[PDB]
């Protein structure tokens, strides 16, 4: 086409979606990871995770307001990945990298799995 | 912080949100612009437009599944702006620039209003 494009638009949209999450505006699901609860927008979760895309495109599950993740999932790993979804920034540390990688494999976040594998390879 | 950042994340999120819109997945509002109807995600509309941010943060209006815009709004102008919200690309043409600018002023999309003003100034 003959379109013009605003370079910062996608980053500005994501920043505003994170501000809505912070302020609990129009959050429509609670993700339960053992004793912890995380509120989020189903659309953002689906846009970032192959697991959430499969869950919310299912005719029965799309209507649930609460999703319980596998008990082996670490809440801190999930929290780091949820922050990544809404900000593009991944808080990857020697002390959390194994939990983050395991959670990203479970959530089907291929780009995160890729950077974790590379950082682990560099340490060996 | 000590975060790493995935450059393409925000653009990839927006691309997936547009794929959900195309497939009518989890769209939760219909915007009526005279005889035309547009389905969208309330969160994307709020992230892009000061008018939709004000509408969906209102305690009564946040619950509406249908929003009727002012009859002076041109459906084609709205369609071009809705496409911009989900893609960052603005289909600005000599034949639509006045309708696009008027719609962007109404929707409170300051960056769009800015580029329309500049293109109009260049023609004079």
């Amino acid at each position: 086409d003959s379109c013009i494009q605003f370079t910062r638009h996608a980053s500005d949209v994501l920043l505003n979606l994170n501000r809505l999450r912070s302020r609990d505006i129009l959050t429509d699901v609670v993700i339960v990871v053992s004793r912890e609860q995380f509120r989020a927008h189903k659309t953002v979760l689906m846009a970032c995770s192959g697991l959430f895309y499969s869950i919310f495109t299912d005719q029965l599950k799309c209507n649930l307001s609460v999703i319980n993740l596998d008990p082996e999932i670490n809440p801190e790993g999930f929290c780091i990945l949820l922050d990544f979804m809404y900000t593009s920034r991944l808080n990857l540390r020697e002390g959390n990298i194994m939990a983050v990688m395991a959670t990203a494999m479970y959530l089907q976040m291929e780009h995160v799995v890729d950077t974790c594998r590379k950082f682990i390879k560099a340490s060996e | 912080d000590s975060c790493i950042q995935f450059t393409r994340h925000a653009s990839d999120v927006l691309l997936n949100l547009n794929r959900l819109r195309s497939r009518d997945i989890l769209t939760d509002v219909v915007i009526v612009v005279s005889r035309e109807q547009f389905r969208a995600h309330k969160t994307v509309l709020m992230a892009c437009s000061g008018l939709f941010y004000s509408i969906f943060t209102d305690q009564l209006k946040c619950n509406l599944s249908v929003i009727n815009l002012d009859p002076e709004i041109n459906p084609e102008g709205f369609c071009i702006l809705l496409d911009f919200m989900y893609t960052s690309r603005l289909n600005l043409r000599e034949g639509n620039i006045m309708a696009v600018m008027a719609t962007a002023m109404y929707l409170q999309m300051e960056h769009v209003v800015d580029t329309c003003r500049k293109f109009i100034k260049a023609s004079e």
Binding site: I4, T7 | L90
Partner: peptide
């Protein structure tokens, strides 16, 4: 704004 840019030409994409």
């Amino acid at each position: 704004w840019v030409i994409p």
